[PDB]
Amino acid sequence: SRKKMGLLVMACGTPYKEEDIERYYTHIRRGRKPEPEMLQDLKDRYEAIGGISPLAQITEQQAHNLEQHLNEIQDEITFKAYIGLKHIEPFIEDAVAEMHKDGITEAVSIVLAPHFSTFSVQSYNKRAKEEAEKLGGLTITSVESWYDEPKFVTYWVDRVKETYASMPEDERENAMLIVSAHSLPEKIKEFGDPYPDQLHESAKLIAEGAGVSEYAVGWQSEGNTPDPWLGPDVQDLTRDLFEQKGYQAFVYVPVGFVADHLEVLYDNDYECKVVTDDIGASYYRPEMPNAKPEFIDALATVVLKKLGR
Ligand SMILES: *Cc1c(C)c(=O)n2c(=O)c(C)c(C)n12
Ligand SMILES: [Cl-]
Ligand SMILES: [Cl-]
Ligand SMILES: [Mg+2]
Ligand SMILES: [Mg+2]
Ligand SMILES: [Mg+2]
Numbered sequence: 001s002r003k004k005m006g007l008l009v010m011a012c013g014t015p016y017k018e019e020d021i022e023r024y025y026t027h028i029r030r031g032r033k034p035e036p037e038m039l040q041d042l043k044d045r046y047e048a049i050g051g052i053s054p055l056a057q058i059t060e061q062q063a064h065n066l067e068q069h070l071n072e073i074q075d076e077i078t079f080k081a082y083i084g085l086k087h088i089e090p091f092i093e094d095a096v097a098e099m100h101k102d103g104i105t106e107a108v109s110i111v112l113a114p115h116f117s118t119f120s121v122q123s124y125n126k127r128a129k130e131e132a133e134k135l136g137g138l139t140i141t142s143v144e145s146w147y148d149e150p151k152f153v154t155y156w157v158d159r160v161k162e163t164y165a166s167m168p169e170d171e172r173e174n175a176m177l178i179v180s181a182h183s184l185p186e187k188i189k190e191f192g193d194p195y196p197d198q199l200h201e202s203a204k205l206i207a208e209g210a211g212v213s214e215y216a217v218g219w220q221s222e223g224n225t226p227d228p229w230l231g232p233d234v235q236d237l238t239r240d241l242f243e244q245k246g247y248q249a250f251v252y253v254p255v256g257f258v259a260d261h262l263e264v265l266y267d268n269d270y271e272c273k274v275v276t277d278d279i280g281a282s283y284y285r286p287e288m289p290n291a292k293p294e295f296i297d298a299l300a301t302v303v304l305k306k307l308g309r
């Protein structure tokens with residue numbers, strides 16, 4: 001007498017091989033194919049971070065581990081996971097169509113991004129519900145945010161504590177914690193979008209639980225459009241704080257991201273590292289959640305809380 005439920009896990013997506021770069025970035029750029037020089041630059045960046053194929057495996061592993069863990073920790077519901085991506089197949093609509101074809105009538109969705117925004121999360125949930133409505137006979141209840149789930153806060157708190165415990169004593173007393181997420185166009189403010197407030201609260205909760213008194217909030221990985229995006233960018237923030245107070249170590253927590261992808265392995269571990277190397281400071285960036293059991297249990301709790309169980 002276990003009830004059957006779909007578990008729709010949504011994410012941005014990643015190329016599966018080098019020859020996917022063109023079509024992935026064309027989709028991100030709203031139909032504008034990157035010029036040859038940019039295509040070559042992107043290939044070089046992926047080669048520099050160790051290759052493309054490991055990156056797509058992570059979302060698959062997160063969805064699989066989440067399904068199995070959810071089915072182990074309670075006895076009322078049997079979940080089946082379906083992956084729906086924004087920028088490459090399987091797309092969100094493909095996942096909903098597959099759920100419908102398989103006989104799913106009830107689903108719960110979650111986006112692998114802990115902060116709500118009108119640009120990403122709300123768009124993903126709207127797409128999923130609209131496909132379900134067009135097909136009929138299937139309903140979806142959607143997680144909207146989960147940055148404040150205690151288990152997730154604790155993941156990052158314990159990683160930050162481990163990092164501060166490892167540094168030399170002079171660094172430990174003169175370090176700066178930078179907490180960041182993916183930048184979005186500033187115009188989201190016109191809708192009252194809580195995304196910036198939620199990033200600031202994540203930073204408060206992590207710094208507080210870790211006992212870190214000196215921290216700052218920044219943004220990273222902005223796209224390219226004429227209208228402004230949320231700032232300051234982590235590169236400028238790092239340099240400005242160093243000019244202000246001479247910090248000897250910077251610790252980066254990209255809380256908006258859940259996996260080892262280009263926006264962390266390159267935009268932090270390279271682009272921020274260039275700045276810290278130039279100023280003479282040490283660089284630290286603790287492990288991303290990926291598919292680790294502590295993170296999977298946090299996500300399972302988010303899902304069961306959403307269902308009132
Ligand atoms: C992959 C991706 C894009 C294109 C984007 O705008 N964002 C976000 O805001 C997040 C959190 C992720 C992932 N992505
Ligand atoms: Cl929610
Ligand atoms: Cl929310
Ligand atoms: Mg090849
Ligand atoms: Mg909430
Ligand atoms: Mg960039």
Ligand SMILES: [Mn+2]
Nearest residue numbers: 064065068069
């Ligand atoms: Mn397993």
Ligand SMILES: [Mn+2]
Nearest residue numbers: 200216217218
């Ligand atoms: Mn601020």
Ligand SMILES: [Mn+2]
Nearest residue numbers: 182221222223
């Ligand atoms: Mn981006």
